[PDB]
C-alpha cells in the first residue's frame, strides 16, 4: 500500500472548504473530509473510487 494511505487527512492552511476523500485504512473505505484548497497531502482524492484504486491494497 503506498505509504501515504495510512496518514490522517490534511485540511491544510487554506480557507476553502472543499469536500475530498481520504482512505481510512482502519475502515478499509474512503471517507470525506474538508480540504482547504491548497497544499494537499497525497491521501486526498476527488472520489471514493480513486481513493480505493490507489490505497485499497493489492
Swiss-Prot record:
Keyword Signal: yes
Keyword Iron carried by entry: no
Domain BPTI/Kunitz inhibitor intervals: 5-55
Disulfide bonds: 5-55, 14-38, 30-51
Any one GO BP annotation for this protein: negative regulation of thrombin-activated receptor signaling pathway
A GO MF label: calcium ion binding
GO cellular component, one term: serine protease inhibitor complex
Location of the protein in the cell: Secreted
Name of the featured protein: Pancreatic trypsin inhibitor
Gene source species: Bos taurus
Residues of the full protein shown: 36 to 93 of 100
Amino acid at each position: 500500500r503506498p505509504d501515504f494511505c495510512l496518514e490522517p487527512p490534511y485540511t491544510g492552511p487554506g480557507k476553502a472548504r472543499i469536500i475530498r476523500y481520504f482512505y481510512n485504512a482502519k475502515a478499509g473505505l474512503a471517507q470525506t473530509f474538508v480540504y482547504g484548497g491548497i497544499r494537499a497531502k497525497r491521501n486526498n482524492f476527488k472520489s471514493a473510487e480513486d481513493a480505493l484504486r490507489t490505497c485499497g491494497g493489492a
